[PDB]
């Protein structure tokens, strides 16, 4: 797996507080657009919600 | 910049020690800093119970040094600071580019 991009999931119940950051939720999965970033890793919700997401609360599913 | 005045700043402590020292805290948001080689770029050692692969995990956000006029210290591509102390105060609350937004300082 990991052809070009990977999927990540939020371990805890994190919530947004800024337009830039993206609201998350447990058992919620997204995609990875920017893994190079050390702090936040861009994600794209199926719904179409794009914003910066945490790195520690997110982990690559690694299929 | 007499950083010895602050607690997050700690040069006498090594990186390896910084990892275990924060672990002793056992708290979410536990943040600390460590003097790096660069005379103008320490290291923000952030500890938070997270990541499933390995927990507890230690996050090290090296301060981005963008030698500008002024501006140089920053870790979020959002706002830039001319002093580390500022980055520590701003992130301590409001809303910054930290996976846990500094909220709990630690001493060496």
Three-state SS at B20 = helix
Nearest to B92 by CA among B46, B58, B57: B46
Q: Do A56 and B99 touch (CB under 8 A)?
A: yes
Structurally, chain A folds into a number of domains equal to: 1
Query: Residue A28 sits in which domain range?
Result: 1-63
Structure-determination technique: NMR
Chain B residue with the nearest C-alpha to that of A39? B98
Domain of B64 in residue numbering reads as: 1-108
CATH number, residue A38: 2.30.30.40
Whether residue B72 has a cis bond before it, omega within 30° of 0: no
Give CA–CA dist B4/B60, Å, rounded.
Answer: 20
Hey, what are A51's tokens?
């914003």
Residue B31 is part of a domain; what is its CATH number?
Answer: 3.30.505.10
- d(CA A22, CA A43) in angstroms, rounded, equals 8
Distance CA B40, CA B61 (A): 14
Contacts of A57 in chain B (CB under 8 A): 50-51, 99
Count CA within 13 A, CB hemisphere, residue B41. Answer: 14
Closest CA to B58 of B16, B96, B97, B90: B16
Can you give the C-alpha Rg of chain B in angstroms? 13
- Which 8-state DSSP code applies to residue B10? -
| Nearest-angstrom CA–CA distance, B108 and B95 | 26
Q: How many CB atoms lie within 10 A of CB B5?
A: 8
Residue pairs spanning A and B at CB distance below 8 A = 37
Pairing verdict, β A50-51 and A43-44? antiparallel
Query: Domain tally for chain B?
Result: 1
Residue B59: φ, ψ to 5°: -100, 125
Q: Is A56 within 8 Å of B50 when comparing Cβ atoms?
A: yes
């Amino acid at each position: 797996g990991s052809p070009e991009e990977t999927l990540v999931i939020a371990l805890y119940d994190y919530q947004t507080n800024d337009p830039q950051e993206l609201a998350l939720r447990c058992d919620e999965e997204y995609y990875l657009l920017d893994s190079s970033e050390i702090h936040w890793w861009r994600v794209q919700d199926k719904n179409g919600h794009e914003g910066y997401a945490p790195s520690s609360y997110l982990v690559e599913k690694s299929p | 910049n007499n950083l010895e005045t602050y607690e997050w700043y700690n040069k006498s402590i090594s990186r390896d020690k910084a990892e275990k020292l924060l672990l002793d805290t056992g708290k979410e948001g536990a943040f600390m800093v460590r003097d790096s080689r660069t005379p103008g770029t320490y290291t923000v050692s952030v500890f938070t119970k997270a990541i499933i692969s390995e927990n507890p995990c230690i996050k090290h956000y090296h301060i981005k040094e963008t030698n500008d006029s002024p501006k140089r210290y920053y870790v979020a591509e959002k706002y830039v600071f001319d002093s580390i102390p500022l980055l520590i105060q701003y992130h301590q609350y409001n809303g910054g580019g930290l996976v846990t937004r500094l909220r709990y300082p630690v001493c060496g």
